[PDB]
Design an enzyme around this catalytic site. Structure first.
Site, PDB file in Angstrom:
ATOM      1  N   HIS A 198       6.523 -17.217 -34.862  1.00 25.13           N
ATOM      2  CA  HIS A 198       5.368 -17.809 -34.159  1.00 25.13           C
ATOM      3  C   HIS A 198       4.548 -16.730 -33.440  1.00 25.13           C
ATOM      4  O   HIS A 198       3.426 -17.069 -32.949  1.00 25.13           O
ATOM      5  CB  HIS A 198       5.807 -18.946 -33.262  1.00 25.13           C
TER       6      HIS A 198
ATOM      7  N   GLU B  29       8.155   1.455 -23.869  1.00 21.44           N
ATOM      8  CA  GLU B  29       7.422   0.927 -22.728  1.00 21.44           C
ATOM      9  C   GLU B  29       8.307   0.587 -21.567  1.00 21.44           C
ATOM     10  O   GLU B  29       9.369  -0.065 -21.743  1.00 21.44           O
ATOM     11  CB  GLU B  29       6.634  -0.304 -23.133  1.00 21.44           C
TER      12      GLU B  29
ATOM     13  N   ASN C 169       6.207   0.064 -17.821  1.00 20.02           N
ATOM     14  CA  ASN C 169       4.992  -0.550 -17.317  1.00 20.02           C
ATOM     15  C   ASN C 169       4.025  -0.620 -18.487  1.00 20.02           C
ATOM     16  O   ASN C 169       3.536   0.429 -18.982  1.00 20.02           O
ATOM     17  CB  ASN C 169       4.400   0.237 -16.172  1.00 20.02           C
TER      18      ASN C 169
ATOM     19  N   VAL D 198       0.443   1.076 -17.789  1.00 18.00           N
ATOM     20  CA  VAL D 198       0.352   2.483 -17.374  1.00 18.00           C
ATOM     21  C   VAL D 198       0.994   3.331 -18.411  1.00 18.00           C
ATOM     22  O   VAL D 198       2.137   3.025 -18.869  1.00 18.00           O
ATOM     23  CB  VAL D 198       1.041   2.713 -16.021  1.00 18.00           C
TER      24      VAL D 198
ATOM     25  N   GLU E 152       6.129   6.424 -24.283  1.00 12.58           N
ATOM     26  CA  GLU E 152       5.670   5.462 -25.298  1.00 12.58           C
ATOM     27  C   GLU E 152       5.504   6.050 -26.668  1.00 12.58           C
ATOM     28  O   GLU E 152       5.117   7.278 -26.806  1.00 12.58           O
ATOM     29  CB  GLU E 152       4.276   4.940 -24.909  1.00 12.58           C
TER      30      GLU E 152
ATOM     31  N   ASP F 159      12.438 -19.294 -37.020  1.00 11.25           N
ATOM     32  CA  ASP F 159      11.402 -18.586 -36.249  1.00 11.25           C
ATOM     33  C   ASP F 159      11.744 -17.101 -36.173  1.00 11.25           C
ATOM     34  O   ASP F 159      12.199 -16.558 -35.126  1.00 11.25           O
ATOM     35  CB  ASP F 159      11.257 -19.193 -34.822  1.00 11.25           C
TER      36      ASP F 159
ATOM     37  N   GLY G 196       5.416 -15.359 -23.212  1.00 15.85           N
ATOM     38  CA  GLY G 196       5.205 -13.914 -23.256  1.00 15.85           C
ATOM     39  C   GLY G 196       6.473 -13.153 -23.563  1.00 15.85           C
ATOM     40  O   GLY G 196       6.398 -11.937 -23.931  1.00 15.85           O
TER      41      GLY G 196
ATOM     42  N   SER H 284       8.485 -14.374 -25.877  1.00 19.11           N
ATOM     43  CA  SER H 284       8.719 -14.778 -27.302  1.00 19.11           C
ATOM     44  C   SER H 284       8.786 -13.592 -28.234  1.00 19.11           C
ATOM     45  O   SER H 284       7.997 -12.649 -28.085  1.00 19.11           O
ATOM     46  CB  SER H 284       7.635 -15.693 -27.795  1.00 19.11           C
ATOM     47  N   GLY H 285       9.735 -13.658 -29.145  1.00 18.77           N
ATOM     48  CA  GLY H 285       9.900 -12.609 -30.139  1.00 18.77           C
ATOM     49  C   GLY H 285      10.842 -11.509 -29.684  1.00 18.77           C
ATOM     50  O   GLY H 285      11.308 -10.695 -30.492  1.00 18.77           O
TER      51      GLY H 285
END
Ligand SMILES: NCc1cccc(N2CCCC2)c1
Ligand SMILES: [Ca+2]
Length: 223
Positions: A40, A52, A54, A57, A62, A84, A175, A177-178
């Protein structure tokens, strides 16, 4: 994550953020080229953000790598959320290191009562909204099949499990999700759905990753 804790920077080195101009879903790095997320969360134009903490920032660990291909599970149903799960291939291989690392796939399903780590950048309030900058974590047990089914009559399939706290207060949320549910060092779940967040008798529902390992392996082997 509602009712969790600040993980600490790069302590969850397989957690990625899916970005399309902004964070919109989590995912889990499973080798240098491939990420596991929820079907989804599918969209075009995904940039995978590894390393990651923050997400607002640039802190120095990263790696930002665009997706080359997304593969939604062949049997995903967007109405029931059955199956899903999706795979995302990166256009270039991630540099693996102590802060950007793959998470092992399970070799058998986990049992109810097994403690897991659930993480993400989703909403931290059960009423209201507040989105964190840094990664949040929650330790939560897998709940029995029977109590998951009684919490959500008619909706829990054999490709889903519940985890969290029937008393509410501590859950995944919008947020998240996944993102990952890791239990004894294996990726056992993907944050999938629930009715609200952190409500009594409405625990989080998670894609049951152990059912998908031979699809994930064969897909990676041919793509
Ligand atoms: N509380 C589990 C869960 C995890 C991921 C998303 C969601 N929903 C999104 C909108 C409201 C609840 C719930
Ligand atoms: Ca950052």
């Amino acid at each position: 994550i509602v009712g969790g804790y600040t993980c600490g920077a790069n302590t969850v080195p397989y957690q990625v953020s899916l970005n399309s101009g902004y964070h919109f879903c989590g995912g889990s790095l499973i080798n240098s080229q491939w990420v596991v997320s929820a079907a989804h969360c599918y969209k075009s134009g995904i940039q995978v953000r590894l390393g990651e903490d923050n997400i607002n920032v640039v802190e120095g660990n990263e790696q930002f790598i665009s997706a080359s291909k997304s593969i939604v599970h062949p049997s995903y149903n967007s109405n029931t959320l059955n199956n899903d799960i999706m795979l995302i291939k990166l256009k270039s291989a991630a540099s693996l290191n102590s802060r950007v690392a793959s998470i092992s796939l399970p070799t058998s399903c986990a049992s109810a009562g097994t403690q897991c780590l659930i993480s993400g950048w989703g909403n931290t309030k059960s009423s209201g909204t507040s989105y964190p900058d840094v990664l949040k974590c929650l330790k939560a047990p897998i709940l029995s099949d029977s109590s998951c089914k009684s919490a959500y009559p008619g909706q829990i399939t054999s490709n889903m499990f519940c985890a969290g706290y029937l008393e509410g207060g501590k859950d995944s949320c919008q947020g998240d999700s996944g993102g990952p549910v890791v239990c004894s060092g294996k990726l056992q779940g993907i944050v999938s759905w629930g009715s609200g967040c952190a409500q009594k008798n409405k625990p989080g529902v998670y894609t049951k990753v152990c059912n998908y390992v031979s699809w994930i392996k064969q897909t990676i082997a041919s793509n």
